[PDB]
């Protein structure tokens, strides 16, 4: 059900996704696995899918995604809770590059993302500024950049939030 | 209630996005304009920290790591570097390693410093240094200086000295530069107002290079006198440089 | 009446197809799904019997000559082999004949069997054998064995031994393989559980190959010890092979 | 008149055709000449044009096409009767590859095609299974394959045969 | 939708399954992937899932499953059509053992299974005699046995077929 | 219509099985009784063709490869072999390779044929032969005969001669036997009314075996005289055996 949404979200790009979750009791295990083959330059909408996982759960949580270099493709592992020992990128809003060697990994949770977003003076208003991962697969390495992306037309985004606010 | 908020302002949208999938697609694809298009850096700067679409810009205004897709200087060269075929580009400098006659700027540096065959053996032993020069020539009037690496095993490092007071490395150029020089660390420095990229070993399909045959060709070639003297002055200026490990 | 039928069941359609041309176009273009997508073969199998879109598959399940456009193993590699530019590919292995340093697997076979220059002269005399290796390397971990051809004039034949118990030659790969080795017959065999392609002469723009210069480079190169011993064991296993004419 | 039809039939592919036939008295000489330049991968619908020639004639015949390698292009020569000495491919339904060297030729008649079709257990129902020649021009050789091709949707083909049966 | 059924079918055993199919136009690509870890002794109901795939399709097909040794687990790859070159076990009804070395594979289609079933004098009546794969994972090898399995109580199976026949 | 049928008799059930999932589970689990519980075989028979739950039965009634779960002779021993812990069983015969004193039947074969230390060196060089004996002893009164392998490199093969005219190898026993002897082929034969398993090499964590220390212990040990003479008669009977490759 979430994988249907996740495939829809990534349908614009060329990132392969792999095919249950209880809203009351969310699992600690891996929820999705997005793959990205060598040569690709696709973008993963991190903040969107993280905040999508928060709305999906009715119990308090801190969603987390793990980015790993398999040594052939890129791997994005979805989670509702950041596992024990799992890595977090020390990046700031301006300095946001992370290079991964073979088998190495980084990640980002919603809470650590909020710290970075507030620390950089970034606009917290819904869908005005959203963190996304630009990934380039230059073997043997995987190049990642945790960039904040805004809309081309903000007036369009503000009217969409009114359409959602109307139906409530 | 106190832990909950915080802020819960996304909930109305995600309820709506479930009902409206065609809006969810356009919203995600809509988030395309990056908020930070360029960011300042400081020297010495490791070029390995730059990803495939990053361009480097060095000037009196400062040092900046910009996004290529929003950079005017990158846009101007984007038609010239439009092919970007790495299968041919890797084979290109591999093939051009065989014939080093046209590349006066590269050989002149060896000729000016130490014109023996043993010096030419030590240079041709590290073919990634020529690759670095070949890439940076294409995307123009650079100068190369070979020095000994004092914080490593008996092998040499190359300085790539830029001519102008303003410098701009295209994103495709430094993508190629880093790819071609896997096993060499590239760091950008400044020394006596001259920007310079130090290319040294950090820790491959190449042809067997005949040091004697090129040494024979070196005697037949007539170098530009003013270029050799330039190197002698440049080697003299870079003697007390001491780039950090 | 008795000779006539037989069967005359197409006549209603062809009357209709004359009246309706726009249906006739879609009917002809409609007949696109091939009924036989793969067919079994037996070894020894002459690869010359395979056309440009045929792929070969060798395993414990049997030996099959499949159509590339309906083959899952061919589809997976189709983006990797997507350029298919033969003007560049013919020039590629012609250019790479000049520099044989990276290709340890090819030279190691000579080094292990007979490390003289006269053996290296006899190998480099037949450059289509290197082309065969170059093509089969691209689309990975093959081994080559040079033996004497006892049913022909004084010239050698190459065995290409595959590592795995399952084998799959892509349609583009064997199209290139057959094109590159015009004047050599390629036949697929099995010997002591190892699949092997015998490349021998049956009945061209190449650079003049210096046997002494590569022989000089051979002494400088340090081979992997376990790879040379592997060849010695493999040469020992293939001595009593006797591939038929 | 037949060349108009033959050009229409081949209009989907890139095979050049060269520009009279009496239905009561069909000629023994060559009726059409289809050419295919070096590098091409086009498909010739053999069984269709053979059965088209049978319907064209009101006198009993055995239509035949000759495939030849000129040493520059491929040549398909059309005939209403197989000439004396003209070659026939020994191919079966499963083993159907024929390689042609320069100036060498093969061919196929409707009667020998029917033998192959019945011997391979192939469906004789109209337009369900039709022999076609896949040709690849890899100079100096010409690679041919006599493959049976069916429709992507059989239910569409069955409704077309009803449309023809209606108008009768 | 088929994976829901396939997981239900395998829920008695301990064989992991990996998570769309059009009934009118069935895909030639792999449909399911069942995995079986080292040490296990689980049984795969081959004939059942093969005949399940036949009922799922409204267009004529010949379903096929491929059994492979990855060199760590066992792999069962589902298909609606047997791909070109894909292996078939030469086994009979009585002699039905196949050992697989690392990376080697075998398989079985519904049509080749019907030949074996008729050749061995096996009962073709629905659910009375069904081929199943007993697999033992003894590394580095994978041991397979294509055994026909009947019900413990046939009178129960006959009454179930009446319950299905009633609802029609 | 003619191609369709054939037979379409499963369609009513699968429509019902979609509606009734709890029936589909019981139907699948219900199919548990195997139709063929034992099947005949012929000698020579490669034991590698037997899977983990297969048992071998050799007698005047014939040779049979049965399913262990339906076999009465397997059921009787199933409580005795109930632990089946392979971590301990692999470590067991590895540990028992160190101390070979109790195992008179194994050493007596060496003592009777050739009582030198060089013969004991050649036996202890192939420790999988002892493992074979150890496994077949547990699940009782077998005899071992060491001969030279004439269709292989200079190494020996073992015959395991059974005492009785009826023989039954438990499924767990031959599972252990095949697992312990990876790199040895085991084939069942019959020779002069005696069933025999030939264990030879086809194409590991073991302790370093001191041939001199066991040779010292051999002199202290007092063998049963009637057992050594038995071996001499048995070696005499198996001289013209010639087991096929
Ligand atoms: Cl540096
Ligand atoms: Cl041959
Ligand atoms: Cl034997
Ligand atoms: Zn730029
Ligand atoms: Zn293929
Ligand atoms: Zn038993």
Numbering used by the authors:
A (entry chain 27), D (entry chain 1B), E (entry chain 1L): 4 to 22, 26 to 174
B (entry chain 26), C (entry chain 1A), F (entry chain 1K): 19 to 157, 160 to 223, 229 to 270
What does the paper behind this entry write?
Although nucleo-cytoplasmic transport is typically mediated through nuclear pore complexes, herpesvirus capsids exit the nucleus via a unique vesicular pathway. Together, the conserved herpesvirus proteins pUL31 and pUL34 form the heterodimeric nuclear egress complex (NEC), which, in turn, mediates the formation of tight-fitting membrane vesicles around capsids at the inner nuclear membrane. In the nucleus of infected cells, pUL34 recruits pUL31 to the inner nuclear membrane to form the nuclear egress complex (NEC). Thus, the NEC represents self-sufficient machinery that can mediate inwardly directed vesicle formation.
To study the assembly of the heterodimeric complex into a hexagonal lattice, the former was fitted into the cryo-EM map derived from cells forming native NEC-coated vesicles. A lattice model was generated by global rotational search of the heterodimer and applying 6-fold symmetry; no further constraints were applied (for more details, see Experimental Procedures). The modeling resulted in the location of pUL34 most proximal to the membrane, thus validating the overall orientation of the fit. The long axis of the heterodimer is tilted by ∼70° relative to the membrane plane, i.e., being 20° off from a perpendicular orientation to the membrane. Our hexamer model indicates that pUL34 loop 88–93, as well as the pUL31 ZNF and loop 77–79, forms the intra-hexamer interface stabilized by hydrophobic interactions. To form a defined curved lattice that is key for successful budding as observed in situ (Hagen et al., 2015), the inter-hexamer interactions also have to be specific. These are established between hexamers at both trimer and dimer interfaces. Our model suggests that the hexamers’ trimeric interface is formed by pUL31 helix α5 and that the dimeric interface is formed by pUL34 loop 22–26, each interacting with their counterparts on the neighboring hexamer. Finally, the fit in lattice arrangement provides an indication where herpesvirus capsids as NEC cargo are likely to bind. The membrane-distal face of pUL31 is thereby suggested to form the inner coat of the cargo vesicles. Overall, the fit, based solely on a combined clash and protrusion score while not taking any mutation information as constraints, is consistent with previously reported data and results from our analyses presented here.
